[PDB]
Automatic annotation (TrEMBL), chain A:
UniProt source species: Thermoflavifilum thermophilum
GO molecular function, one term: metal ion binding
Span of domain TIR: 4-126
Name of the molecule in the record: TIR domain-containing protein
SUPFAM superfamilies according to UniProt: Toll/Interleukin receptor TIR domain (SSF52200)
Record has 4Fe-4S as a keyword: no
Gene Ontology BP terms: signal transduction
Keyword terms of this UniProt record: Metal-binding
InterPro entries, per the entry: TIR_dom, Toll_tir_struct_dom_sf
Automatic annotation (TrEMBL), chain B:
Residue numbers binding Mg(2+) 3: 507
SUPFAM superfamilies per UniProt: Ribonuclease H-like
InterPro entries, sorted: RNaseH-like_sf (IPR012337), RNaseH_sf (IPR036397)
CDD domains in the cross-refs: Piwi_piwi-like_ProArk
Name of the protein described by the UniProt record: Piwi domain-containing protein
Length: 424, 507
């Protein structure tokens, strides 16, 4: 006896229908709309016995939709069977509605203009409702919020679904048993770059921190031949990772710091004797593959170098070690370009172009390229790093993986294409 | 396998006591939190600029759709959203003539160019503000495209178009002191040289210079390009729009409206659920490269409570920078001074002292400045210092599909540091918030003690108070979102004594 019916074409006028239904409900009116539910007999019964005002959305798609016209015909019969001169209230929302396309049953009535302002249209609809004494309850925007959250945001919520994720943290399985400090003292020249040695070594305080041996630097440091290896301080790496080691000579945070500083140099050196080229960044180094290498530019059917417009893109990696909370090597992914597949463009170009190329890649592609690169420069199921003549570190080519309790339903309709088209 | 937690998306409160996760939907269904009755628009620019502004004002009356209205929700219209009217009937127009622009835009130096044009706009704004009363809410600076192109740093004007010459070079301009002689004709040209040289103390970008030189007058300004409001009419040599807004028009309308609505005095929304007494302080540093001292830099603080109408405190200049480690740290004095400024402002606003004080920064605090912070901190007020970095190499890839990880997932390293996925997939929009794979921000309670999960929740909620951008959520909290903007505005005038001011005067 007091419901407000809204006939509309779906999904052409879904936005306006949702807006008007929710606003009228929050204002206190009781509206009936198929958009608020999750069958023709029900519609017929409602228009005939429960609808006080029948609103029809007048658009180009509504006046030709067959179901909307069926509901309008039922509404015409009903209107005839009462006395309501205003039982049918069209809502003109389409400024592209040609006059010759309006249905005859709508063109003979006066509609409410929503084309110039939805606010003005709503004010006019509410004025007509007030003058017609249409029943309504005091405002309840909480019900409008509830319907918005449970009907329209139904298939758009986060669900409790366990989801596993791969990461860029590749763990280090094998560690040299002892991290050593060699008291070279006068045997190490004061003005010598401890960054040129074949094995990663860095200064601490009169000592030299390294995983390599006492005499692993003889060819470059002659005086170290007179050094007694017993003067070296060897610390258990397992006691450094587990936090068991902490003295006045050196502290655990410092220990782990020198260990990552050695791991980074070990990666940089191992990259030298490998089938990769280099790219210098602000402080680190990235590594890529030339165009001529690999079978048709694909490792395990993964394009690692390819063509963009007038240049060639190359996927690249950079490495940085960390050992808290777990000892891993974090690999960052980058893109670097060449003109012919070998020689870099030294400029902006390599930025703009990176942005413009990477926008086309998504989760699948980035993950595939990172894992494929990592598996390419592997040496087995891992990547050996030489921190000494007989010591080494092993980084698994399978990354540390996480898992969560809340995931989402993947939208099969890939809107990533629409997003990546936005290249303005 | 390491385990992640999920932080439920915080809610923002709108009109009629309703809470939601998307500000566009909450504004459309219910309306703005605060309510105003009309936007009295002040317009500075050419007559064509006024025409473009009036055309956009007429356009936003009707609905404006996006391409994919699920990712970017539609715009029902200004009156149908804010319950207000932004009519062209109430436009106080102060005309900038075309010959006025030609008089000052064709100088060989970029600094004098930008200074003269910023002055031309600012004098109109301030004169209309003072003389004929303060009757407008926001001043809309309609910038022509030529000004925007040539009034920027590292922008060269063709020598053939130059009409007025330069008198002093950039290297000697900042050292030029005008000292008079007893030759009048000589002193005139010396004064002209000084007039040119003084502009090199300001930053040669129209936007920051205009907003900074307008700080001492406290006048809300929304700077819109002519090509932003009429992008269909700004084409290239191929007859195609340079800036293509065709698929996001509605979103554009959502951004210009909301921002304007905030500058006109109304607050569109605030945080739905936050503990009383909390106060968030985002540090801001900007190196003053003009000064010879490599450590010289300007400092500032942005205070936020439960809404996006934050407060900006300008600090002093000093050697806050350490070229060595590349981290800015404040000296004891300025730490005390800035924190006292912020706490006294909080006491003036809330008539009490904050129960907690979260200091947000991109670097780790040193003990020297943290002890100075503790000195002024009341006592029974928990004061901690959080580090948000973003530059932490951890990426989580979904094992299958092109869609990335969902926003809200968090990896807690320990009781003091965690990883937060402010970006990623969001089920509401059924799309992503960032291109490629999202990089989670890293959070660390560097100095102080507090719950890690509560700090994470507070940051995630703080990614929702952006009034300029009318979007679902931001990537970083508002405490650091506009740090570079505030920093550059503070170093663009180099002649300011600004008091504590609201965000709408920098934002
Ligand atoms: O028909 C009708 C269209 C559908 C979206 C906007 N207006
Ligand atoms: O539909 C959709 C939301 C609800 C009204 C307009 N925008
Ligand atoms: O109020 C009103 C209710 C809610 C949906 C159907 N009618
Ligand atoms: O226009 C208008 C139409 C003419 C007949 C009644 N309503
Ligand atoms: O080159 C370029 C890299 C890609 C990621 C960030 N910077
Ligand atoms: O604002 C305005 C409110 C929203 C629903 C109808 N009245
Ligand atoms: O400016 C310009 C581009 C067009 C859409 C987004 N920003
Ligand atoms: Mn210049
Ligand atoms: Mn602005």
């Amino acid at each position: 006896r007091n419901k407000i019916f809204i006939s509309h074409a779906t999904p052409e006028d879904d936005d306006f229908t949702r807006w008007l239904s929710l606003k009228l409900i929050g204002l206190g009116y009781e509206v009936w709309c198929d958009i608020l539910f999750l069958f023709w007999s029900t519609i017929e019964k409602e228009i005939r016995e429960n609808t006080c005002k029948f609103l029809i959305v007048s658009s180009t798609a509504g006046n030709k939709r067959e179901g909307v016209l069926k509901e309008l015909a039922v509404a015409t019969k009903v209107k005839k069977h009462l006395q309501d001169d205003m039982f049918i209230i069209p809502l003109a929302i389409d400024e592209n509605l040609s006059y010759d396309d309006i249905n005859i049953e709508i063109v003979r009535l006066n509609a409410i203009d929503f084309k110039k302002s939805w606010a003005k249209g709503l004010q006019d609809l509410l004025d007509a409702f007030e003058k017609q004494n249409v029943p309504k309850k005091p405002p309840d925007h909480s019900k409008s919020n509830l319907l918005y959250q449970q009907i329209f945001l139904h298939d758009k919520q986060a669900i409790e679904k366990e989801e596993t994720y791969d990461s860029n943290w590749f763990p280090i399985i094998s560690f040299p048993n002892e991290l050593r400090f060699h008291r070279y003292d006068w045997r190490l020249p004061k003005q010598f770059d401890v960054r040129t040695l074949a094995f990663p070594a860095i200064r601490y305080k009169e000592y030299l921190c390294t995983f390599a041996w006492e005499y692993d630097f003889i060819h470059q440091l002659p005086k170290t031949e007179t050094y007694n290896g017993q003067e070296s301080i060897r610390i258990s790496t397992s006691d450094i990772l587990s936090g068991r080691y902490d003295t006045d000579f050196i502290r655990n945070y410092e220990c782990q710091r020198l260990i990552v500083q050695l791991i980074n140099k070990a990666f940089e050196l191992r990259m030298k004797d490998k089938n990769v080229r280099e790219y210098q960044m602000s402080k680190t180094f990235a590594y890529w593959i030339e165009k001529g290498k690999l079978e048709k530019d694909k490792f395990e059917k993964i394009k690692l170098v390819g063509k963009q417009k007038n240049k060639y893109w190359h996927f690249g990696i950079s490495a940085a070690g960390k050992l808290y909370p777990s000892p891993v090597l974090m690999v960052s992914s980058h893109i670097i370009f060449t003109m012919d597949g070998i020689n870099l463009i030294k400029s902006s170009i390599q930025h703009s172009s990176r942005r413009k190329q990477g926008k086309n890649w998504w989760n699948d592609k980035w993950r595939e390229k990172l894992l494929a690169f990592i598996r390419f420069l592997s040496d087995q199921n891992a990547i050996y790093l030489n921190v000494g003549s007989e010591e080494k570190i092993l980084i698994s080519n399978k990354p540390l993986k996480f898992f969560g309790k809340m995931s989402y339903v993947t939208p099969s309709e890939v809107t990533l294409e629409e997003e990546s088209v936005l290249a303005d | 396998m390491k385990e992640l937690i999920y932080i439920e998306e915080p809610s923002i409160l709108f009109a009629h006591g309703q809470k939601c996760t998307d500000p566009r939907d909450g504004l459309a269904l219910f309306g703005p939190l605060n309510q105003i009755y009309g936007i009295k628009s002040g317009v500075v620019g050419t007559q064509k600029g006024l025409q473009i502004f009036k055309s956009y004002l007429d356009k936003i009356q009707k609905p404006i759709y996006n391409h994919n209205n699920i990712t970017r929700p539609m715009f029902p219209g200004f009156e149908a959203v804010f319950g207000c009217k932004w009519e062209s009937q109430n436009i106080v127009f102060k005309e900038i003539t075309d010959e006025e622009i030609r008089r000052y835009l064709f100088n060989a130096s970029t600094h004098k160019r930008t200074y003269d044009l910023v002055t031309l706009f600012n004098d109109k704004i301030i004169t209309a503000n003072k003389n004929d009363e303060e009757r407008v809410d926001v001043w809309f600076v309609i910038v022509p495209e030529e000004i925007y192109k040539y009034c920027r740093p590292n922008s060269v004007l063709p020598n053939e178009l130059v009409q007025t010459k330069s008198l002093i070079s950039k290297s000697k301009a900042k050292s030029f002191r005008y000292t008079p002689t007893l030759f009048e004709e000589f002193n005139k040209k010396l004064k002209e040289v000084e007039k040119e040289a003084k502009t090199y103390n300001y930053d040669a970008q129209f936007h920051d210079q205009l907003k900074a030189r307008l700080l001492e007058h406290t006048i809300p300004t929304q700077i819109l390009r002519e090509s932003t409001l009429a992008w269909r009419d700004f084409k290239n040599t191929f007859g195609a729009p340079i800036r293509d807004f065709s698929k996001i028009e509605g979103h554009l309308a959502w951004t210009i409206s909301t921002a304007a609505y905030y500058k006109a005095g109304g607050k569109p929304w605030k945080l739905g659920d936050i503990r009383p007494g909390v106060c968030y302080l985002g540090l801001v540093y900007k190196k003053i490269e003009k000064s010879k001292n490599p450590q010289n830099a300007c400092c500032a603080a942005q205070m936020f409570l439960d809404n996006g109408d934050g407060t900006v405190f300008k600090g002093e200049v000093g050697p806050w920078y350490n070229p060595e480690k590349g981290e800015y740290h404040l000296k004891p004095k300025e730490a005390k001074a800035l924190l006292t400024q912020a706490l006294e402002s909080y006491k003036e606003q809330n008539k009490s002292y904050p129960k907690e004080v979260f200091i947000h920064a991109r670097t780790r605090f040193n003990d020297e400045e943290w002890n100075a912070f503790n000195e002024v901190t009341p006592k029974n007020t928990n004061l901690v210092g959080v580090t948000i970095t973003k530059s932490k190499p951890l990426k989580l890839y979904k094992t299958e599909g092109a869609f990335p990880i969902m926003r809200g997932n968090a990896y807690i390293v320990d009781e003091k540091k965690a990883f937060l996925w402010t970006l990623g997939f969001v089920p509401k929009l059924q799309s992503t918030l960032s291109m490629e794979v999202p990089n989670p921000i890293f959070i660390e309670i560097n100095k102080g003690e507090a719950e890690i999960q509560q700090v994470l929740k507070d940051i995630l909620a703080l990614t929702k108070l952006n009034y300029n951008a009318c979007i679902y959520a931001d990537g970083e909290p508002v405490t650091l979102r506009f740090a570079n903007k505030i920093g550059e505005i503070l170093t663009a005038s180099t002649e300011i004594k600004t008091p504590p001011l609201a965000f709408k005067y920098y934002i």
